[PDB]
Amino acid sequence: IKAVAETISTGPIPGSRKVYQAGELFPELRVPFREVAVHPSANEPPVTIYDPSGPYSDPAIQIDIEKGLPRTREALVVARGDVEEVADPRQVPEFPGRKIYRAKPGKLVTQLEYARAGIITAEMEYVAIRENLRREQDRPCVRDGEDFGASIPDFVTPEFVRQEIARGRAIIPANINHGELEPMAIGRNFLVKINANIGNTVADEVDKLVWATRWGADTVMDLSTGRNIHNIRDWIIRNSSVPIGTVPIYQALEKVNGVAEDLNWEVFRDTLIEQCEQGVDYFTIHAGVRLPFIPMTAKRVTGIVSRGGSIMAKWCLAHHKENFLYERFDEICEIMRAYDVSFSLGDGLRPGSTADANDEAQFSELRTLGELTKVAWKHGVQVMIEGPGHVAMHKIKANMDEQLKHCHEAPFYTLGPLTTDIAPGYDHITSAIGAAMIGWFGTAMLCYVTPKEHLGLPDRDDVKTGVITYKLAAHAADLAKGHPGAAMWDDAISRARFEFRWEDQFNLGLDPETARKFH
Amino acid sequence: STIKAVAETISTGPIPGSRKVYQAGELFPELRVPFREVAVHPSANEPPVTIYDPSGPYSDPAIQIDIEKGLPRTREALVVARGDVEEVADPRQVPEFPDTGRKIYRAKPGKLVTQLEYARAGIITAEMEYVAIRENLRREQDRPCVRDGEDFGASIPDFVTPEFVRQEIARGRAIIPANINHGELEPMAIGRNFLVKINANIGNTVADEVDKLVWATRWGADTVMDLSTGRNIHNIRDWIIRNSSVPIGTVPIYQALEKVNGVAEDLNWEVFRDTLIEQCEQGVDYFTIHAGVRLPFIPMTAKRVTGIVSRGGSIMAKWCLAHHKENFLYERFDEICEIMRAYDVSFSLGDGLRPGSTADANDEAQFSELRTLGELTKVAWKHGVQVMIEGPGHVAMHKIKANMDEQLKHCHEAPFYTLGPLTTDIAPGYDHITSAIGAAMIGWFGTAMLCYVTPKEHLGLPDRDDVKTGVITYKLAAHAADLAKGHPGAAMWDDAISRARFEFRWEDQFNLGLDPETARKFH
Numbered sequence A: 001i002k003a004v005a006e007t008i009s010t011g012p013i014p015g016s017r018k019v020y021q022a023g024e025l026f027p028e029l030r031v032p033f034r035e036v037a038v039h040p041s042a043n044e045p046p047v048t049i050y051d052p053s054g055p056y057s058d059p060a061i062q063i064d065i066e067k068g069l070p071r072t073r074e075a076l077v078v079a080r081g082d083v084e085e086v087a088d089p090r091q092v093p094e095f096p097g098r099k100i101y102r103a104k105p106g107k108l109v110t111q112l113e114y115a116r117a118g119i120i121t122a123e124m125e126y127v128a129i130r131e132n133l134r135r136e137q138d139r140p141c142v143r144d145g146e147d148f149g150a151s152i153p154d155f156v157t158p159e160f161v162r163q164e165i166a167r168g169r170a171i172i173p174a175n176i177n178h179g180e181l182e183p184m185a186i187g188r189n190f191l192v193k194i195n196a197n198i199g200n201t202v203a204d205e206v207d208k209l210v211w212a213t214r215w216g217a218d219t220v221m222d223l224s225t226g227r228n229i230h231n232i233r234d235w236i237i238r239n240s241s242v243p244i245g246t247v248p249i250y251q252a253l254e255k256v257n258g259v260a261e262d263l264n265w266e267v268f269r270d271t272l273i274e275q276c277e278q279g280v281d282y283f284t285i286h287a288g289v290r291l292p293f294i295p296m297t298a299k300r301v302t303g304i305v306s307r308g309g310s311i312m313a314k315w316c317l318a319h320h321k322e323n324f325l326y327e328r329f330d331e332i333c334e335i336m337r338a339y340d341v342s343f344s345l346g347d348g349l350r351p352g353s354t355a356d357a358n359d360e361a362q363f364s365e366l367r368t369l370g371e372l373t374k375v376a377w378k379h380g381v382q383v384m385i386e387g388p389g390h391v392a393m394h395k396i397k398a399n400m401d402e403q404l405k406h407c408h409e410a411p412f413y414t415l416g417p418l419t420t421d422i423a424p425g426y427d428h429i430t431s432a433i434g435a436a437m438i439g440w441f442g443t444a445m446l447c448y449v450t451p452k453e454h455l456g457l458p459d460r461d462d463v464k465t466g467v468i469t470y471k472l473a474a475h476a477a478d479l480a481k482g483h484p485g486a487a488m489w490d491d492a493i494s495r496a497r498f499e500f501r502w503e504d505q506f507n508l509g510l511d512p513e514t515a516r517k518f519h
Numbered sequence B: 001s002t003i004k005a006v007a008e009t010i011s012t013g014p015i016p017g018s019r020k021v022y023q024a025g026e027l028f029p030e031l032r033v034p035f036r037e038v039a040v041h042p043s044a045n046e047p048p049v050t051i052y053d054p055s056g057p058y059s060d061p062a063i064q065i066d067i068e069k070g071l072p073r074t075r076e077a078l079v080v081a082r083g084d085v086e087e088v089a090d091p092r093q094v095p096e097f098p099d100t101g102r103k104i105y106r107a108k109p110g111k112l113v114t115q116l117e118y119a120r121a122g123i124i125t126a127e128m129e130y131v132a133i134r135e136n137l138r139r140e141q142d143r144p145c146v147r148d149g150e151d152f153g154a155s156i157p158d159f160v161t162p163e164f165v166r167q168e169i170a171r172g173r174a175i176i177p178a179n180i181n182h183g184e185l186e187p188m189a190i191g192r193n194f195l196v197k198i199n200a201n202i203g204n205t206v207a208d209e210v211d212k213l214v215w216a217t218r219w220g221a222d223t224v225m226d227l228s229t230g231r232n233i234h235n236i237r238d239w240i241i242r243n244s245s246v247p248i249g250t251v252p253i254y255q256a257l258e259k260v261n262g263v264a265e266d267l268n269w270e271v272f273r274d275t276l277i278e279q280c281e282q283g284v285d286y287f288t289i290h291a292g293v294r295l296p297f298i299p300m301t302a303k304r305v306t307g308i309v310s311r312g313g314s315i316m317a318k319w320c321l322a323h324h325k326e327n328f329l330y331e332r333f334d335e336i337c338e339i340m341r342a343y344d345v346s347f348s349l350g351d352g353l354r355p356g357s358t359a360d361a362n363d364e365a366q367f368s369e370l371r372t373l374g375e376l377t378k379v380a381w382k383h384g385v386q387v388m389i390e391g392p393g394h395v396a397m398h399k400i401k402a403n404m405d406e407q408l409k410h411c412h413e414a415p416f417y418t419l420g421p422l423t424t425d426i427a428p429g430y431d432h433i434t435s436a437i438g439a440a441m442i443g444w445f446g447t448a449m450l451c452y453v454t455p456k457e458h459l460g461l462p463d464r465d466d467v468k469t470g471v472i473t474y475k476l477a478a479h480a481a482d483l484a485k486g487h488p489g490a491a492m493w494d495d496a497i498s499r500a501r502f503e504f505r506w507e508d509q510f511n512l513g514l515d516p517e518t519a520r521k522f523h
């Protein structure tokens, strides 16, 4: 509590300052960016950089993790008139005022539902502003890139955001119970986003949360297992300005003392409700691990490597019945749409080795995920699809084409891929290669990999390394795609290099203090 | 005294988890071709895994290292045996290395001497069999084979034979950098149809540099370049070459420039010429030479974001603008070939006009130079000199294939040798990563050798630890390319380590990684 209050890193990002752009449709919005001014003699405008760090890097805002972040999104949600306060919330150190919400009976609360109704929500304008990086349409816009048939506009408008969401091609993860959130969008026609994984002291985890988003993590997932992951997660969500994801089966397994066999729908249901009221923005759910797909993995070089996938497979095998997450998929949807939680359909059968890439198991699950996508959309629930994994370079394009076709252009969310298995200790690098390429091919979010992958638990230095690696991978992809806003950054830093403006070069880099130190 | 400094600092002995093994030549029965081998747990019932090993005798317990004497000159006797070279009457003489045991050689007038000349003459040399054996990683030659990859129209065989190697050299599509005066060399091949090689740069105390050489090759550097500037550069380089089992490259203009006291305008042919001969006799295996930076090309760089970033290129640009004359490396190219051919030194045609930023990638100057390199290539071949081509640079991902396409066409499939490329400019201090991305991709598209990049790129001088990070980063990039190309030897390594991860054989997982000590420590 107090041990965290000091250990966490706050203050402006070295070389820059927090700036805000206000909304027009919703005049009270303040959309955050960070700004990097260069030498006056350079005679250039400051450079605007996308910033997921939150109020933590704004000295005007008092931080107190014991109280949580300001709930600056709560008012915009209540004002829509479709949510009511939950009379008696579910209940499980404890986090020390916050009302808990749920859609009114018969009301529609998801971003997808709103978008299909023709409605531009506050979150949507928020995202449109955020995605433009304060660029003005004052100069001609010439595209240099190859985006493989994507529809990235010269300039994002709130109406474009609504169009993308309504068609299922973008999502805004935004539980009505995460009032702290600074809205972001995931989708091919926007900037490539990245995810940081946290989870095994409360301070340590909040710390990694703040550290991860300080350096550019766009979402964070709390992958905690073991004792007291509910209370733990309170501390993270209340103090997070980025979307927070989870794998609900992890906690459900704990309730049944780590026995996959003893898992059931009731425990999983209770867990969902608990996490919905908590403010979790997306759930990874391995509903595509079907009974008959499991024997397809017996011949694999590395079997089933997914944690969530292994758990479901163990249940299916012990009972010899169809995956109950797959079975109750409609009932899962009826819960999530009441709070606007997004689906992240998991790859239980992802390749754990390049030998296993693009095999029958992986693709069978993938095509099943596409089917479930349409069922999710019918209930008005937003979706993204999870991908591999270990994939040699010549198979990465093929991964992307299978997803695009079989999953109806829903956003893709990958773990790497790692492009070779032979370099433990450097897996952030083997995966950065695969991550940059697949993002180029159209992947919307990249889950990070740290050097400790396959070996140990990431400390806050491994977290940073991972985040910086994936930020540069994501940006390399934006640039190759010809994203309208990518090359101003590269050109700014390159003009500084040219003129020997060493300080501007450091301040414009993903990691200014490391660059200055090495110089 | 320097010798104590050196012998104490350098890392020697078995590479953790593996042991030096040799395969004997058959065409040349005295050849001993090195690999390293990693045995896995007996309960796995698997043969040891054979790994390509450029570490040299430093990790061979059968050999007693002694830097004062240099490395075993195991190559001298095969060179001499051909009867095409003779001792130099009066060798050029420039902490000095005790170079008393080494005869210096030069081609006899009218004799064949270069690997390219022998190859075109239908001759299979000791270096050719050596590399063919090496490239096979001790795999079984009489075996059905089916390849899973996409090599974009390469000509990779299921199994490398000495004649395949000869054929590749003769058409100019592969080289073997091997100066007759580098008797310590363990021969290696560079070519699209062989394993992707990597290069580590060192240079700026002698013991500092010899350590980096040993450290670099220990972790998998296939060649090394001594990019030293300033004073003592000839004498330092003695300590490197005599103690290198890998090919050593330089950029001769760096030294030529020092002889004329930093003034690029005072360079001239006489000083360049004398530099070439000195390094030829020293045993330098390849010369990066920026002969494509032509006078009319220089104003094209004016419209660039970062202009001319090549050090060698900038030096030549300065000379040209000052004397208002065509690049003399270009004008006297013929004479340069006649010198190199007499010692079998390979050309590395430098990219003086490479893009220093993604913005300038694939522009007029870059490609104008590339087509010129392509024309110099034919002239070099006419003189019987081996050639590889140097390339970018900073290039965003979507422009990378186009680079390979232009190179293959205009430079007639000669081997390509890239520095990265870096695929974005905004991560100083992580440029080994931004460039690993480009390097793996262009390796996949057919690039033969990848010049590495460390976290210090653009910022500082790499220390011991930066050199290793760069080397490991490029080894995995080069391997990622081999795997994606469907190279017949690549999958075995990845599969072995994946079986170890699956069966929870931690020791084996550690030992089969590019960096065993790190993995064990992280675990």
Ligand SMILES: O=P(O)(O)OC[C@H]1O[C@@H](n2ccnc2)[C@H](O)[C@@H]1O
Residues within 6 Å of the ligand: A197, A221, A223, A247, A284, A305, A306, A307, A308, A309, A346, A347, A348, A350, A386, A387, A388, A389, A413, A414, A415, A447
């Ligand atoms: O599938 P398992 O349970 O192994 O791993 C879940 C974690 O891996 C991430 N992921 C992303 C794509 N595939 C998997 C997912 O977002 C979460 O961070």
Ligand SMILES: O=P(O)(O)OC[C@H]1O[C@@H](n2ccnc2)[C@H](O)[C@@H]1O
Residues within 6 Å of the ligand: B201, B225, B251, B288, B309, B310, B311, B312, B313, B348, B350, B351, B352, B354, B390, B391, B392, B393, B417, B418, B419, B451
């Ligand atoms: O062009 P300059 O003189 O800056 O750099 C030459 C170094 O950079 C390497 N290189 C490789 C491809 N392009 C450049 C070349 O092999 C040598 O190692």
